[PDB]
Amino acid sequence: GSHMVGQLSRGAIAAIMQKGDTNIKPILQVINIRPITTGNSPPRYRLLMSDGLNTLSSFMLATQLNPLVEEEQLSSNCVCQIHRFIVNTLKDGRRVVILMELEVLKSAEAVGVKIGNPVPYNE
Ligand SMILES: O=C(O)c1cc(-c2ccc(CN3CCc4cc(-c5ccc(C(=O)O)o5)ccc4C3=S)cc2)n(-c2ccc(Cl)c(Cl)c2)n1
Numbered sequence: 353g354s355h356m357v358g359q360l361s362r363g364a365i366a367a368i369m370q371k372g373d374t375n376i377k378p379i380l381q382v383i384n385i386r387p388i389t390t391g392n393s394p395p396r397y398r399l400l401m402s403d404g405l406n407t408l409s410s411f412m413l414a415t416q417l418n419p420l421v422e423e424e425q426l427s428s429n430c431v432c433q434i435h436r437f438i439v440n441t442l443k444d445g446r447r448v449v450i451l452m453e454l455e456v457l458k459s460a461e462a463v464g465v466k467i468g469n470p471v472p473y474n475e
Pocket of ligand 1: 387388390398409412415416440442447450
């Protein structure tokens with residue numbers, strides 16, 4: 353409905369990156385999903401997510417959630433609530449957000465557009 357950006361947890365990306373408290377259950381939009389190079393393990397999916405203010409490309413799906421992607425319930429434009437995530441930090445300092453449990457609140461086809469004008473989150 354009207355005020356589409358009000359459907360998303362504006363500021364959650366910065367909170368996940370700046371404070372790292374995992375108690376929040378933010379509502380985010382999927383902007384894009386792609387496989388990463390895995391070679392010889394289960395496929396792994398990387399997501400570009402939006403909270404309405406920012407996008408962030410550092411999200412990875414837990415492999416237990418792969419069927420959501422592979423059966424097309426989880427695709428570009430859908431709106432999701434994250435019920436469980438963790439943050440991991442690489443040796444080089446970059447952070448990865450692993451999505452463990454999530455719920456699709458609105459399918460891609462029911463939303464249909466990138467909500468708002470989110471900009472990339474910087475480090
Ligand atoms: O081929 C490419 O294009 C590519 C390739 C990577 C790329 C490679 C390697 C890594 C390292 N790594 C790997 C898998 C992984 C899995 C889990 C985890 C916990 C629970 C579950 C589960 O149930 O599945 O999984 C927790 C931590 C990791 C980490 S730190 C990250 C990222 N990336 C990449 C680089 C930077 C970022 Cl910020 C991201 Cl999200 C991906 N891109």
